[PDB]
Symmetry: D2
Amino acid sequence: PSLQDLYAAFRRIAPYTHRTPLLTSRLLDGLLGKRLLLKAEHLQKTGSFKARGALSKALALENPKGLLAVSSGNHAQGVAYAAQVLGVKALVVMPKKACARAYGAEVVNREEVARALQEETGYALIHPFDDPLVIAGQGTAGLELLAQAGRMGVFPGAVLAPVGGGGLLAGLATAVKALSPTTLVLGVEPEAADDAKRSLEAGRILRLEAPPRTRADGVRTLSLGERTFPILRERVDGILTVSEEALLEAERLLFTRTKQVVEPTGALPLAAVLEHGARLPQTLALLLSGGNRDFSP
Amino acid sequence: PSLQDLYAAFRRIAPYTHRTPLLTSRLLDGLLGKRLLLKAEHLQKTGSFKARGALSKALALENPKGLLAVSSGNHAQGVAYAAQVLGVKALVALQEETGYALIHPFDDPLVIAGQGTAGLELLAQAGRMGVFPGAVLAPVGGGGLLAGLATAVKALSPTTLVLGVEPEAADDAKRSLEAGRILRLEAPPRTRADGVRTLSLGERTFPILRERVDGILTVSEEALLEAERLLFTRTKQVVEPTGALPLAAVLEHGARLPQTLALLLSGGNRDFSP
Amino acid sequence: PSLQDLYAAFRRIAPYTHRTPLLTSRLLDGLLGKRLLLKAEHLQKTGSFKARGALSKALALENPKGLLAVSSGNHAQGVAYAAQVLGVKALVVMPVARALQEETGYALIHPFDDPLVIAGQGTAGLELLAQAGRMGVFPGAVLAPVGGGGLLAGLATAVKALSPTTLVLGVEPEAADDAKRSLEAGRILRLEAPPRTRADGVRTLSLGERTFPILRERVDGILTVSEEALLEAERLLFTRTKQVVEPTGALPLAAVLEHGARLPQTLALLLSGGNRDFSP
Amino acid sequence: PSLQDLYAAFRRIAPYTHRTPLLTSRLLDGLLGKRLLLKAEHLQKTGSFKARGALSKALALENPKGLLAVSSGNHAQGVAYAAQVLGVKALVVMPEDPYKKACARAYGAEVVDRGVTAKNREEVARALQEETGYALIHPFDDPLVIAGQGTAGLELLAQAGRMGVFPGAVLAPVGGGGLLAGLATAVKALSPTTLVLGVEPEAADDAKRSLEAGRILRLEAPPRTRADGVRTLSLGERTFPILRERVDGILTVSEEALLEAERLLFTRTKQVVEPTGALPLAAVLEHGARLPQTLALLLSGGNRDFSP
Ligand SMILES: *Cc1c(COP(=O)(O)O)cnc(C)c1O
Ligand SMILES: *Cc1c(COP(=O)(O)O)cnc(C)c1O
Ligand SMILES: *Cc1c(COP(=O)(O)O)cnc(C)c1O
Ligand SMILES: *Cc1c(COP(=O)(O)O)cnc(C)c1O
Ligand SMILES: [Ca+2]
Ligand SMILES: [Ca+2]
Ligand SMILES: [Ca+2]
Ligand SMILES: [Ca+2]
């Protein structure tokens, strides 16, 4: 999508989503020797940035009968919420479950199950990342980030976000490069599931043989999407990988220092600073993608 | 202390502490059928409101050799940060030895005055929003916070209810107010709210409570846990068990409390769980 | 009135008034060797702080039939605004009224000699301290214009209740220093006739009976200013901050121009109003 | 220029300019039947938006020897301010015919007044340039100046976005076209359906005439109007092509409407806005019926002299 697509997406979803804050922490800054800007999407409607993509697509549909969604978990809640906003029914096909079911969505291998439903109910299928309107929606988070950083008079040398299917990164990259092409846009992946990094270097989409094995449950995707890959090839500077150990440490830091509840895959950007800090610029914007983790006393 | 003491305290500590935000959540509101205002002290320096009290007292001393504290938990950290700010030593009989100044966690005027600054902020912030709470709820241990809070609130709007909250298995402050005298637990209570396992209210806080507090509510351990869960999952905020007591009270006594409530999230220093 | 009266007043009028900004001007701070905090009451409803006092009194009346007042100018608009909020009729007698009082039975809202009016004006003082605290700035003094004494009395009550060490000072044109003279004599001295000054808002013949004792106990002093300084201060606010402030609202700045050297470095100034005629 | 140029200009000038507020007034919205968003450039450093353009060009210069400018108003102050930031000297040429010279000199700029007049000023400056080697900063016919002015448009959309209000049209005054070209670029790049309209005194509608014509049309002599900041005899060479393709139209307003516009802002909002900075509000007064419901108005400046 283009920059205009992103702005139009912002206009459509603005009244139903939060202008999440760009948090800063002197504690973290001082411990890591960096100037960090934390885009708080864990404070977004439904607990993650996914509400943006789902609403962007749902509100552009002309008189749809209902909404249909694969799974993901976070995307399920996003679609359910959008279903509420439009006042229609939402059917979710999952393999985050209780929450989705809560928003008034009936939850229910994958692909074939959805296909048979899309024809059966006639609802609109909302893909979690391989849809132009969905990508435009996720990207609005990038438009905001720049505006907020601008208001602060702080310009990051790099923007770090997690990558699974690539919807968020593709959207973020489109926003950043259209305004400041010299700003690095970096994706982050668990080292145990680095098909995106390998795909980008080889110029072709490589797929993981089997489900990874990482605590970042939001990016256990087998491969990048067909629509997101070409955008990443053109606008993303690189992809960094992190160990499970560093991811755990990143979560611990957010939890204990900023008192924010961020789910594991939402902590990948911080993990990357922990392991590759010396090779990154001084001022970094981190996309805390979600805060939907289970409670434990 | 008086209202002028609290403001005097605010001035001393303002540069070293955060003007904590007053959070609102449409999820909690719609869920509890209330209008809740959450004073986020878990976002205060060191992770709890204790920083205010420690700083309030530390900055009031003339040439302090060092600072001394009787570890209770969050107070230890508060006193450490204070020493740091002053650029002196913090250690949590060593008094006569090194001559360090002892900072009690709740039974000291300047400490109580410091905790109270949270009450002054709450009111100004609510006032800017144009929202006036019918009641302010805060957890109670030794009574420093509740005493400071009551002082700020009653001095400005005596019709606003100031309610303390404590776990049912450690309801000494409630029964102490009932008997017009201090009662004391014989042994540490069995409760998840490790921040309020105090054996009794302080001697300097008790009188302020009988005079300025409207009552103490008790909560079950089950209600506490649920309050923690709602805060965790719905507001995505890390609040330690003791800081979720106010919300636990709304869960168990909602029907008999005002429609608009100010809750004091006293701290966020809870251990990380993978 | 009491600090609690100011807060109750704040609660009554909050919904119908503006929490006006506490403005800061790097330029001004630069031109003067000071750090100035400008309470923007010129941006309040009706154009002046008066809206505060009018609504405080008016919203506490039990089933008022209508409102009537000794029209001073800005007060007239405040009372008129208050009547619109209540939904009753406002009768203003601008250059008698008591007859209309008996006739209609309307409530008379005095411009300054009324506890509820004073309490109302005083809410600007509660805001000022709250906004300044949020900024982490603590002024060594607060300066405000003095006519009837309502504003200064309310302000003095708010500031002294929280920080008595903070200086509270009134300011009036030298051509009308009756309030100043009164604080010296310990009695209410009156002006032989209109003082004639550009600060039209404070050309009252004497301090009020309910405000005078509050001032004698809560006001640290009153400063007088020449008409030349007033004009200068008025030109400064106009060209440097681009704010339309009426002459009387510029008195506190004029005092800095003439007495700066003997005032603390950080000062809070109350810009009382911005209701001046337009002139291309 | 380009949207990236605008953002680049923003980055360069950000630390030395104000992110001026997007003011809203219940009163104004009441009088007119509109939702008005007022971009307060009168609150910008030096009193007008021109500080943006000036800094944008000046900060981009390498090892400048000094700054030079030929202006009869606000641009002079902008350049002088820019010169203070760089730490170099500023030379301003203005005809020997107000107090606006005092402000320029206030920012530490040297003013060449001697026997200077219109038509003659350009030659005097060219000569001063040749002699000093100082860089000349044009008030509107320079890509970096236009990019700088356009940053106001970037802020405007961000601020509007933050409050969730999307203007159906943006209105700004038109003199040389720098402000309008920069604003049109920012706005059209993000949302093309959003109307961008200029406003000029009807006694100087050369811009409106040029856009309808297809080429630049100049004025015989100095126009007669209160709006002193837009008495430019004609649009600029670099701004005109941008306007022709990125501007939806130009509105003209009576001197009567302008005066009322100024009165309303002065009395209702308590803001000191110079007459030309009031043109956008005047357009609403006279053409409100043909404009959308939600309008963004560019209050270009607040540099009018004090009047007791
Ligand atoms: C969906 C999701 C991601 C991954 O985004 P992709 O568009 O699939 O790259 C990352 N973090 C969280 C919390 C998510 O929900
Ligand atoms: C210390 C503490 C309390 C109780 O305060 P007292 O002044 O001792 O009543 C409550 N919550 C937390 C998180 C604390 O650290
Ligand atoms: C009424 C008024 C004053 C004077 O206040 P008193 O309460 O009468 O002392 C000063 N400035 C303005 C703009 C006023 O309207
Ligand atoms: C210079 C100026 C204008 C006109 O801008 P142009 O870029 O020359 O069209 C409008 N208003 C004010 C206050 C100005 O200074
Ligand atoms: Ca992967
Ligand atoms: Ca107890
Ligand atoms: Ca007098
Ligand atoms: Ca023209």
